[PDB]
C-alpha cells in the first residue's frame, strides 16, 4: 500500500491520472520522481522547467555540478540526483526529442531506467515538447516498465484520450 490517490489502473503495475506532476510530487513526496530531462540537464521548459522552478532552481544548481563532473547523459540514459523539496530522489531520464531528430526507438531504453526503482511518479517520456506521440509513449511504458509506475498527465484532454484509446 502506498499514498498515491485517484489513479486509474491500466495494468498490474501502471496507474494513470490527470494531474500536475509538480503538485502531485509536493503532496505525495514520493521516493522517486522522474524528470523529463535532456542530456545537458538544462531544465528550461516542459516538465523539467516546471520541476526545477518548484525547487527554487536548486535542481538546476545541482545538475550543473553533475554535468561539470560527468559530462552529458546519453539519450535513453538517466542519473539519480536529489529530489529536493519534491521527493527523496529525482530520476532524470532522457527520452528522445523528436523535434531534434532523435531516434524514437530509444524510448524503450529510456523507460528501462524505471525498472531500477520499485515505485516511481513519472510523466510520459518524450511527450509534450519532446514531440513524440503520447499514445505511443504510454504503450512503450506499459510494455517496458515492470516496477510500479504512477503516471501524471497534466492535460485533461490528453488524459481522456489516453484512457479511452488504451488497449
Ligand atoms: C510530457 C509532455 C510535456 C509536459 N507534460 C507534463 N506532464 C505532467 N506534469 C507536468 N507538469 C508540467 C508539465 C507537465 C505534458 C502533459 O500535458 C506533456
Curated annotation (Swiss-Prot):
Effect of residue 31 to A: In strain: Mu/B.1.621
Membrane topology field: Multi-pass membrane protein
UniProt-annotated location(s): Host endoplasmic reticulum membrane
Regulation: Inhibited in vitro by GRL-0617.
Subunit composition and interactions: May form homohexamers. Interacts with N protein.
Role description: Responsible for the cleavages located at the N-terminus of the replicase polyprotein. Participates together with nsp4 in the assembly of virally-induced cytoplasmic double-membrane vesicles necessary for viral replication. Antagonizes innate immune induction of type I interferon by blocking the phosphorylation, dimerization and subsequent nuclear translocation of host IRF3. Also prevents host NF-kappa-B signaling. In addition, PL-PRO possesses a deubiquitinating/deISGylating activity and processes both 'Lys-48'- and 'Lys-63'-linked polyubiquitin chains from cellular substrates.
Protein's name according to its UniProt entry: Papain-like protease nsp3
UniProt domain Macro: residue ranges: 1-167
Organism: Severe acute respiratory syndrome coronavirus 2
Catalytic reaction equation(s): Thiol-dependent hydrolysis of ester, thioester, amide, peptide and isopeptide bonds formed by the C-terminal Gly of ubiquitin (a 76-residue protein attached to proteins as an intracellular targeting signal)
Amino acid at each position: 500500500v502506498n499514498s498515491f490517490s485517484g489513479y486509474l489502473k491500466l495494468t498490474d503495475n501502471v496507474y494513470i491520472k490527470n494531474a500536475d506532476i509538480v503538485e502531485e510530487a509536493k503532496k505525495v513526496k514520493p521516493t522517486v520522481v522522474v524528470n523529463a530531462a535532456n542530456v545537458y540537464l538544462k531544465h528550461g521548459g516542459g516538465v523539467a522547467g516546471a520541476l526545477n522552478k518548484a525547487t527554487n532552481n536548486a535542481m538546476q544548481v545541482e545538475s550543473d555540478d553533475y554535468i561539470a563532473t560527468n559530462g552529458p547523459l546519453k539519450v535513453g540514459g538517466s542519473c539519480v540526483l536529489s529530489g529536493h523539496n519534491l521527493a527523496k530522489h529525482c530520476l532524470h531520464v532522457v527520452g528522445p526529442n523528436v523535434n531534434k531528430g532523435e531516434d524514437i526507438q530509444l524510448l524503450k531504453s529510456a523507460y528501462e531506467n524505471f525498472n531500477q526503482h520499485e515505485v516511481l511518479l513519472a510523466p510520459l517520456l518524450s511527450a509534450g515538447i519532446f514531440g513524440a506521440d503520447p499514445i505511443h509513449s504510454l504503450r512503450v511504458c506499459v510494455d517496458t516498465v515492470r516496477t510500479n509506475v504512477y503516471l501524471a498527465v497534466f492535460d485533461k484532454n490528453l488524459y481522456d484520450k489516453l484512457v479511452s484509446s488504451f488497449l
